[PDB]
Write an enzyme that holds these catalytic residues in place. Structure first.
Site, PDB file in Angstrom:
ATOM      1  N   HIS A 316      38.346  76.543  31.231  1.00 52.82           N
ATOM      2  CA  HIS A 316      39.392  77.399  31.685  1.00 52.82           C
ATOM      3  C   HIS A 316      39.743  78.465  30.356  1.00 52.82           C
ATOM      4  CE1 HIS A 316      41.104  78.990  35.254  1.00 52.82           C
ATOM      5  NE2 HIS A 316      42.010  79.544  34.508  1.00 52.82           N
ATOM      6  N   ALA A 317      39.490  79.777  30.647  1.00 58.52           N
ATOM      7  CA  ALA A 317      39.871  80.754  29.747  1.00 58.52           C
ATOM      8  C   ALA A 317      41.338  80.815  29.427  1.00 58.52           C
ATOM      9  CB  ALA A 317      39.518  82.047  29.864  1.00 58.52           C
ATOM     10  N   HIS A 346      41.233  90.493  29.966  1.00 57.49           N
ATOM     11  CA  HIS A 346      42.318  89.885  30.506  1.00 57.49           C
ATOM     12  C   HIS A 346      43.026  89.022  29.327  1.00 57.49           C
ATOM     13  CE1 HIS A 346      45.091  87.568  32.816  1.00 57.49           C
ATOM     14  NE2 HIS A 346      44.647  86.267  32.385  1.00 57.49           N
ATOM     15  N   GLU A 347      41.865  88.128  28.881  1.00 56.51           N
ATOM     16  CA  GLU A 347      42.436  87.252  27.501  1.00 56.51           C
ATOM     17  C   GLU A 347      42.750  88.260  26.333  1.00 56.51           C
ATOM     18  OE1 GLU A 347      43.101  84.158  28.184  1.00 56.51           O
ATOM     19  OE2 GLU A 347      42.080  84.417  30.019  1.00 56.51           O
ATOM     20  N   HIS A 350      46.333  89.452  26.493  1.00 52.57           N
ATOM     21  CA  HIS A 350      47.448  88.367  26.133  1.00 52.57           C
ATOM     22  C   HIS A 350      47.543  88.405  24.441  1.00 52.57           C
ATOM     23  CE1 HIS A 350      48.203  86.390  29.673  1.00 52.57           C
ATOM     24  NE2 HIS A 350      46.964  85.730  29.883  1.00 52.57           N
ATOM     25  N   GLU A 374      50.219  88.774  32.146  1.00 49.41           N
ATOM     26  CA  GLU A 374      49.095  88.492  32.688  1.00 49.41           C
ATOM     27  C   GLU A 374      48.397  90.001  33.343  1.00 49.41           C
ATOM     28  OE1 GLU A 374      47.782  85.891  32.974  1.00 49.41           O
ATOM     29  OE2 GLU A 374      49.412  84.582  32.556  1.00 49.41           O
ATOM     30  N   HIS A 476      45.095  75.556  37.430  1.00 47.91           N
ATOM     31  CA  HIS A 476      46.831  75.632  37.440  1.00 47.91           C
ATOM     32  C   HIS A 476      47.227  74.493  37.904  1.00 47.91           C
ATOM     33  CE1 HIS A 476      44.746  79.224  36.802  1.00 47.91           C
ATOM     34  NE2 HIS A 476      45.802  79.890  36.242  1.00 47.91           N
ATOM     35  N   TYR A 486      50.438  85.744  38.613  1.00 50.81           N
ATOM     36  CA  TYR A 486      49.165  86.480  38.602  1.00 50.81           C
ATOM     37  C   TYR A 486      49.343  87.288  39.866  1.00 50.81           C
ATOM     38  CZ  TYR A 486      47.426  83.066  35.742  1.00 50.81           C
ATOM     39  OH  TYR A 486      46.798  82.259  34.521  1.00 50.81           O
TER      40      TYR A 486
HETATM   41  O1  LIG Z   1      43.730  81.392  34.934  1.00 43.67           O
HETATM   42  C1  LIG Z   1      43.542  82.562  34.697  1.00 43.67           C
HETATM   43  C2  LIG Z   1      43.303  82.950  33.147  1.00 43.67           C
HETATM   44  C3  LIG Z   1      43.966  81.945  32.251  1.00 43.67           C
HETATM   45  C4  LIG Z   1      45.176  82.617  31.369  1.00 43.67           C
HETATM   46  O2  LIG Z   1      44.686  83.419  30.721  1.00 43.67           O
HETATM   47  O3  LIG Z   1      45.990  83.102  32.573  1.00 43.67           O
HETATM   48  C5  LIG Z   1      45.672  81.717  30.914  1.00 43.67           C
HETATM   49  C6  LIG Z   1      46.069  80.076  31.634  1.00 43.67           C
HETATM   50  C7  LIG Z   1      46.493  79.242  31.115  1.00 43.67           C
HETATM   51  C8  LIG Z   1      45.931  77.937  30.477  1.00 43.67           C
HETATM   52  C9  LIG Z   1      46.503  77.094  29.689  1.00 43.67           C
HETATM   53  C10 LIG Z   1      47.930  76.936  29.800  1.00 43.67           C
HETATM   54  C11 LIG Z   1      48.677  77.853  30.265  1.00 43.67           C
HETATM   55  C12 LIG Z   1      48.023  79.063  30.968  1.00 43.67           C
HETATM   56  N1  LIG Z   1      47.113  82.074  30.134  1.00 43.67           N
HETATM   57  C13 LIG Z   1      47.107  82.423  29.094  1.00 43.67           C
HETATM   58  O4  LIG Z   1      46.044  82.497  28.210  1.00 43.67           O
HETATM   59  C14 LIG Z   1      48.563  82.897  28.563  1.00 43.67           C
HETATM   60  C15 LIG Z   1      49.643  82.811  29.505  1.00 43.67           C
HETATM   61  C16 LIG Z   1      50.778  83.272  29.120  1.00 43.67           C
HETATM   62  C17 LIG Z   1      51.088  83.549  27.720  1.00 43.67           C
HETATM   63  C18 LIG Z   1      50.089  83.450  26.783  1.00 43.67           C
HETATM   64  C19 LIG Z   1      48.674  83.120  27.141  1.00 43.67           C
HETATM   65  N2  LIG Z   1      43.556  83.510  35.624  1.00 43.67           N
HETATM   66  C20 LIG Z   1      43.697  83.454  37.021  1.00 43.67           C
HETATM   67  C21 LIG Z   1      43.738  84.452  37.959  1.00 43.67           C
HETATM   68  C22 LIG Z   1      42.843  85.581  37.498  1.00 43.67           C
HETATM   69  C23 LIG Z   1      43.050  86.750  36.727  1.00 43.67           C
HETATM   70  C24 LIG Z   1      42.284  87.856  36.492  1.00 43.67           C
HETATM   71  C25 LIG Z   1      40.916  87.714  36.945  1.00 43.67           C
HETATM   72  C26 LIG Z   1      40.648  86.767  37.614  1.00 43.67           C
HETATM   73  C27 LIG Z   1      41.575  85.810  37.844  1.00 43.67           C
HETATM   74  C28 LIG Z   1      42.735  82.421  37.421  1.00 43.67           C
HETATM   75  O5  LIG Z   1      41.516  82.311  36.856  1.00 43.67           O
HETATM   76  O6  LIG Z   1      42.699  81.949  38.833  1.00 43.67           O
HETATM   77 ZN   LIG Z   2      46.226  85.137  31.608  1.00 40.83          ZN
END
Ligand SMILES: O=C(CCC(O)(O)[C@H](Cc1ccccc1)NC(=O)c1ccccc1)N[C@@H](Cc1ccccc1)C(=O)O
Ligand SMILES: [Zn+2]
Ligand SMILES: *[C@@H]1O[C@H](CO[C@@H]2O[C@@H](C)[C@@H](O)[C@@H](O)[C@@H]2O)[C@@H](O[C@@H]2O[C@H](CO)[C@@H](O)[C@H](O)[C@H]2NC(C)=O)[C@H](O)[C@H]1NC(C)=O
Ligand SMILES: CC(=O)N[C@@H]1[C@@H](O)[C@H](O)[C@@H](CO)O[C@H]1O
Ligand SMILES: *[C@@H]1O[C@H](CO)[C@@H](O)[C@H](O)[C@H]1NC(C)=O
Ligand SMILES: [Cl-]
Ligand SMILES: [Cl-]
Length: 586
Positions: A316-317, A346-347, A350, A374, A476, A486
């Protein structure tokens, strides 16, 4: 005077020490995430005690300050935040047990596999996600859908009740009512729940119309015997594991099949695109806006693709800040296709944020609110997805121009952007009710589906049973990562797109805007991002858009043409919006 001085001195020490401790923790967490082993897990759990020790120490000191008698605004805010010990408030025994449960859930999710009797075992990324995205066979989709929940979902159940018990306990020790109450406080907004409800209600006409339209198309391909034109949609047919985004079934819903295609995968592959090239392009889009380029170190330490050395990793990204203002990385099991290029942006969003507020005290190195963090990346991805931009990357023959190609584009975007609205809203509605206790463990799954039906208009393809824990099959949930962020992101990213486009001088339909190379657009965002978490988020909102509220107006404006098309198209077929026969299941 001296109280103010004692406070100021406290913050300074908290900062210097936190940077060191936090950096150390990030290092071990990264080593575990990019190499799941017994050793790395051991080291991580031990680093949990170190950072908890530091957190307990300074938090305790922070609580002795009487914040609301401190003059300075920045110091008062930092100290208020340090008083929240989050997990470190738990007694030693509960802390270690909670830390292990979180480790176990994350590992279980990231290593789960679905195997065919005496054959191949598939992983979520990239195998199962590929099946959900490309298969057009009801039974094959079902196999992957049900299998992923049997293996990953069921496997998280044993841990979740204790997890809720402990995260709630921690919240209470921190002054909150439950963990949900604690998560919501991140938006420092008393009217949050009502404000979100209103935004969700505003996108209902658009979702119901998209939903009815897609349902009709699924009815065409999967048969009348499997699709009830007045009921919910089988949850395994939308091209995505959680039916959170539907663009992967665009081929089944193309409004104008005659129009010039917009497939880019074969083009990216043939033209030699690689995960590397995908991130470089995101970096270039950022610098094109006058924004910051990732440091040379980023390319050296990031994990931009799933390892092929037999290492087990968390796919998971995610974007990582190592709290030293120089080391930032992304860990993504990148695949070569447009959908993942959007994830890459998206990444990178961040990362840009990390670099923008790197010079603020670590306590304030956060987005105005989780939603903003996000959104950044998604805003640029909107421009990248346009036919015009995709053509400029050579992934497309033409960019079209025809109104038909225009409706086709809005449709592909809506399949992801609009369909995500109810899913993103649903996730935490479920958790908040689990955290406040209104949903007990015996009702976990039933309540999840009641929400899946109510908000998304979806139904499970096969009856759920005792032992199923579908929520557990969504990253999540076991990773304990809030989700409402999100939902906010998807609304506000359009407000930002709308503002950056106006700032770039764009005229005409909003969906035709591409901010590439606009220094004006870049400046609008940079000023807001540099604030980190220092000011109330409505201030950052106004800097970017000119107004301070969240608003679905931008998103509706973007999709107006599609809404009108969908209406007419659905009324021509006499579609009945919604799912009256809500009790129907395939
Ligand atoms: O889960 C993500 C991307 C992962 C992330 O980049 O949001 C990531 C999630 C994460 C992973 C481990 C611990 C905590 C959160 N969050 C970050 O990289 C992040 C978040 C806040 C601050 C700094 C980095 N997106 C969601 C929603 C989404 C967004 C965009 C396109 C498709 C889907 C999903 O895939 O269901
Ligand atoms: Zn994110
Ligand atoms: C309130 O204090 C902030 C922060 O002050 C800094 O941090 C303290 C702990 C201490 O180390 C101070 O000497 C620091 O200056 C002030 O904002 C900072 O102001 C400086 C100079 O203008 C600037 O370089 C920093 O970037 C600012 N930091 C932030 C987060 O804004 C602020 O001026 C003080 N407010 C008042 C009314 O005095
Ligand atoms: C490059 C640099 O030294 N940046 C520091 C930052 O690490 C620190 O958190 C902040 C204190 O608020 O002061 C900045 O000057
Ligand atoms: C993975 O982690 C283990 C445990 O410390 C270590 O032995 C191994 O060298 C690591 N592999 C990589 C790719 O660094
Ligand atoms: Cl599900
Ligand atoms: Cl959040």
């Amino acid at each position: 005077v001296t109280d103010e001085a004692e406070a100021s001195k406290f913050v300074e020490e908290y900062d210097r020490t936190s940077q060191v401790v936090w950096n150390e923790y990030a290092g071990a967490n990264w080593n575990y995430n990019t190499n799941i082993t017994t050793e790395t897990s051991k080291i991580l759990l031990q680093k949990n005690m170190q950072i908890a020790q530091h957190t307990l120490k300074y938090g305790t000191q922070a609580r002795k300050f009487d914040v609301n008698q401190l003059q300075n605004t920045t110091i008062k805010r930092i100290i208020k935040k340090v008083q929240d010990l989050e997990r470190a408030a738990l007694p030693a025994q509960e802390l270690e047990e909670y830390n292990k449960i979180l480790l176990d859930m994350e590992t279980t999710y990231s290593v789960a596999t679905v195997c065919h009797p005496q054959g191949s075992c598939l992983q979520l990324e990239p195998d199962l996600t590929n099946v959900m995205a490309t298969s057009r066979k009801y039974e094959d989709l079902l196999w992957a859908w049900e299998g992923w929940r049997d293996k990953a979902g069921r496997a998280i159940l044993q841990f979740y009740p204790k997890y809720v018990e402990l995260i709630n306990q921690a919240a209470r020790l921190n002054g909150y009512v439950d963990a949900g109450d604690s998560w919501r406080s991140m938006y420092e907004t008393p009217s949050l729940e009502q404000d979100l409800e209103r935004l969700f209600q505003e996108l209902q006409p658009l979702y119901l119309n998209l939903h009815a339209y897609v349902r009709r198309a699924l009815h065409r391909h999967y048969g009348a015997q499997h699709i009830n034109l007045e009921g919910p949609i089988p949850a395994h047919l939308l091209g995505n594991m959680w039916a959170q985004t539907w663009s992967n079934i665009y081929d089944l819903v193309v409004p104008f099949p005659s129009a010039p295609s917009m497939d880019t995968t074969e083009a990216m592959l043939k033209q030699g695109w690689t995960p590397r090239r995908m991130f470089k392009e995101a970096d270039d889009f950022f610098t094109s806006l006058g924004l910051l380029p990732v440091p040379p170190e980023f390319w050296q330490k990031s994990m931009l693709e799933k390892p092929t050395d037999g290492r087990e990793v968390v796919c998971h990204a995610s974007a990582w800040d190592f709290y030293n203002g120089k080391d930032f990385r992304i860990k993504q099991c990148t695949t070569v296709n447009l959908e993942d290029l959007v994830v890459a942006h998206h990444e990178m969003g961040h990362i840009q944020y990390f670099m923008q507020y790197k010079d603020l005290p670590v306590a304030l190195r956060e987005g105005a609110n989780p939603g903003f963090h996000e959104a950044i990346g998604d805003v640029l991805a909107l421009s990248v997805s346009t036919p015009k931009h995709l053509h400029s990357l050579n992934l497309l023959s033409s960019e079209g121009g025809s109104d038909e190609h225009d409706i086709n584009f809005l449709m592909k975007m809506a399949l992801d952007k609009i369909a995500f609205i109810p899913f993103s809203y649903l996730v935490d509605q479920w958790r908040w009710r689990v955290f406040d206790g209104s949903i007990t463990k015996e009702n976990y799954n039933q309540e999840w589906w009641s929400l899946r039906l109510k908000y998304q208009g979806l139904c499970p393809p096969v009856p759920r049973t005792q032992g199923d824990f579908d929520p557990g099959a969504k990253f999540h949930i076991p990773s304990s990562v809030p989700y409402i962020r999100y939902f906010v992101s998807f609304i506000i990213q359009f407000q930002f797109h709308e503002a950056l486009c106006q700032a770039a001088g764009h005229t005409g339909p909003l969906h035709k805007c591409d901010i590439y190379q606009s220094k004006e657009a870049g400046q609008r965002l940079a000023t807001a991002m540099k604030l980190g978490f220092s000011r109330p988020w409505p201030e950052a909102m106004q800097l970017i858009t000119g107004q301070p509220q969240m608003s679905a107006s931008a998103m509706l404006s973007y999709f107006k043409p599609l809404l009108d098309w969908l209406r007419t198209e659905n009324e021509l077929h006499g579609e009945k919006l919604g799912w009256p026969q809500y009790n129907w299941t395939p």
